[PDB]
Amino acid sequence: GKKRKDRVVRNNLRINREDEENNMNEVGYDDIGGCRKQMAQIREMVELPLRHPQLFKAIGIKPPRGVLMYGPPGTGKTLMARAVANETGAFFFLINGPEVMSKMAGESESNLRKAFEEAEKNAPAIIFIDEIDSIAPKRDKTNGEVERRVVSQLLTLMDGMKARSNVVVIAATNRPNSIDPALRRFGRFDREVDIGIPDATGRLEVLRIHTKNMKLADDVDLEALAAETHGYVGADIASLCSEAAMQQIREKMDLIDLDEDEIDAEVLDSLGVTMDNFRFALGNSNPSALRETVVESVNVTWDDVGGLDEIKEELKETVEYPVLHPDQYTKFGLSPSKGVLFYGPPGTGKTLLAKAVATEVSANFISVKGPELLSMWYGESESNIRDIFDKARAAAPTVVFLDELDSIAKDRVVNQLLTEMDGMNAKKNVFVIGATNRPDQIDPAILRPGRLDQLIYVPLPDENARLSILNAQLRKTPLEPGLELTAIAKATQGFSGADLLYIVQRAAKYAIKDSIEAHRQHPVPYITKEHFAEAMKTAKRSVSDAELRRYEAYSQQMKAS
Amino acid sequence: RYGPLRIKELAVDEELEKEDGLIPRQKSKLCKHGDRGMCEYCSPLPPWDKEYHEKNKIKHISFHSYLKKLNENANKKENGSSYISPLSEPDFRINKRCHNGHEPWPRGICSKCQPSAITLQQQEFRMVDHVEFQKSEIINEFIQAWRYTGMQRFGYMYGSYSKYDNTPLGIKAVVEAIYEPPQHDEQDGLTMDVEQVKNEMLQIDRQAQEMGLSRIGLIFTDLSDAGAGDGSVFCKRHKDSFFLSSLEVIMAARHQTRHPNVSKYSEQGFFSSKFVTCVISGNLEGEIDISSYQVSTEAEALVTADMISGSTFPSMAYINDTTDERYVPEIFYMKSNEYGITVKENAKPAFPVDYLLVTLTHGFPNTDTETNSKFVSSTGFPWSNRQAMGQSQDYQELKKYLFNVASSGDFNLLHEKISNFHLLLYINSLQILSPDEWKLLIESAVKNEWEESLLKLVSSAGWQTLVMILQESG
């Protein structure tokens, strides 16, 4: 039937009881959602060498042995590996790093040797080494002799297996730099897979999978939950479901007695999770994936960015044509631009434009905010520039958006970034976008050819741009019917997008204040023109005239040259 | 030689090497994985797993299992080396010729040919595991010797080796007969000229090999009588006292060095002779319990370069002094304390011999199994060299013992009387029988399907002459 299984028959084929009930393993491909690309890569690397070795013999190639797999914790790496192992239906030998490292001296090596030898005996085999960073850490951090011995044993075993063997090794780690570099060469963990946070569709799929056994109430809007939840890895969603169930139980506690050992079945039948429970769980949830740099998945288009039509078409020509039409570049032998740098007053929407550009080529997105760069400069952060570019390579194509670059480019970090950029593969489609407010203050060394040589000026929005921004921002907010924003736009000459968002937020705050006051005294389904009038009266341009004059003078000087 | 050495050894070694000895284990309750795929607790247990041995009350690891451990520990296949012999018998003798620029040891030495400090430590693998006595008579007669005379005894024990299922890859030495060399036993000890003993034993062992036996140890009795009404004996060998004093350890080490075990996994081709020594002392009660022992390999290579001598303290062995042709480096013996820390104590004046021994398990064949004893005998024709007692081999005893049976027939009765080890040895000594006639005699007396061979033997003129002279003789 399925899951290599051959009403009772359907249950047996998957189409004491406690040992199996708590051991409901054999999680197939139906238990994973939102990671179609990574799952496809893993399946291609694993199944074919084992299921169909004849192809490689026919062509005459050696299938890769190692498959490194790294990503943020709680993203389901171990679950994905277990699902692959079970679906392939082949012998597989678990190895948990902490357990191997939690044994007397002179026995961890014995366990590793036994594992590899046994996996060799019953080929085909899949050795899944979990938390490989706990047994082969970076050399400097752990100088313990036993750790070096274990690393050497692992390296020897890894080298010695690549001979007419059907053993495929899968490893999991938090970051690509935690593992000792010696395990990332030929005949070793060379093929790497990066797992990023799921997008809206991924979160919806995860919620669907988790919320299949729970007795949901009919008033569930999982689409709203998927839209709201951002930066939620699978573990966070599971904890969210648990919190929702706990909140429902707490609400229903009024009809149950703590002292009584037994609980009425009729009361149990009324445990229905409501949207309120999910909202409370969201209130209590503590996502942490964004604390470190991770590969996102943007979905912006050429509709959220108003104006900048010349800039839009220039970016299209500079980016899409290489990626989408490499044939013409190869025909003319022209190297595509390796980056571009945006300069202009703050709040003009550089990030939105970069995200839209990244979405155009249908590529993942990495964001590196300035504080993270500063933390790396001070050496008090887990990640690193080398790690960022390694993840970008593993997840290519990608767009790496450096933000607040002027903070560090007023040294070590700048030189390291230059090294990483120059050493990057030109042919590979990886682009680096930069954001800054002080283009002159940027280190000139960056603007050399083969680097962020292209300069693009992002001007303040005009009347049409302001109108478009106002229209876009108010999509998720009711407004007075027949309300025109052209007057507001023209009265807001010189304002930036951030100022317009602040105006809208203040008007909505006044509206909610009025509604709350009226209800307390107890009606306001819309936002009347008085709210917007007062908000406009109580707002000011965030850009001083002097900065605008200097920016335009600098732009004119750049044009003249 | 680009791989393992090429040589032919005992069949037991071959058959043991063929096996792997893995002890299977079933799904533990702590596993987290589907039916297929074993994580860490469901894996087969290697035969050398010390936890299993110490959990089953086995003090040593069945040498072949130790060989498997050593082979697994290194020697990767298809690459990584060109084969390094895993077993090497330690040698302490100073290299007489090193010559980095210095002259031989007597008047010059460097730091490259200086015997490094020796760290004595109890061995962990015992070559031969179980010593097995086929029948109670074989040792009952030996002890009867002491009963009658009162003096101690000493005798080699011939036999053959075989598997031992009760232990992982274990070996058992089944002893078939005991031969007593000419020795001068006494109340407190025994003495015997080595030259005569070896000269006699050469031919005796040649005849035994012709018969299919092999010399597989020495057994001596250290028994004293107690004051109880019955026959009770003190237990002078217990934990507090000495298990084996210095001199017996020295003699056992010499014997082991002179009976090397041929092995395929050493540069020289031999390692840790499969020689077992048995001593009769008496258990904590008045019984006459026996015991077995075997001196470790270091002691085997220690006595060869002298370096050890007996001490007035029974439980300690004296250490000799440096001199030309004999260089003795500092000897550290390593023990364990009650806090789980190994302590190295220098013992130059004298050190206990408990670190130079490994103990074997004696026993007897199950009394409800098939009988494969070579000789249904040993209560008959008196043994060889019991001159001190009245027993004496000669024509008259043969006439009294093996005449009426032959003169009439009843071959079923005759066969057992002809399958006596000492009887065969004596008749061969007489040289009356022809070589091939004696060969068929032994083939009839030590093998089944003997009817035709026995009839042929009684046909041959040699046997007719034997019986005729026996009858004629008084």
Ligand SMILES: Nc1ncnc2c1ncn2[C@@H]1O[C@H](COP(=O)(O)OP(=O)(O)OP(=O)(O)O)[C@@H](O)[C@H]1O
């Ligand atoms: N598609 C999915 N992606 C991520 N998590 C998922 C997915 N589907 C279900 N989950 C749930 O997310 C959690 C992932 O736990 P898991 O142990 O796999 O995380 P991990 O961080 O990869 O593990 P480890 O660091 O121990 O290797 C589990 O609750 C799993 O049920």
Ligand SMILES: Nc1ncnc2c1ncn2[C@@H]1O[C@H](COP(=O)(O)OP(=O)(O)O)[C@@H](O)[C@H]1O
């Ligand atoms: N077309 C647009 N032009 C300008 N700003 C916009 C536009 N669309 C949205 N915005 C708003 O402008 C803000 C810009 O934020 P960010 O990109 O972090 O700063 P900056 O734009 O100065 O780099 C966003 O919070 C967004 O809500």
Ligand SMILES: [Zn+2]
């Ligand atoms: Zn298991």
Ligand SMILES: [Zn+2]
């Ligand atoms: Zn020398």
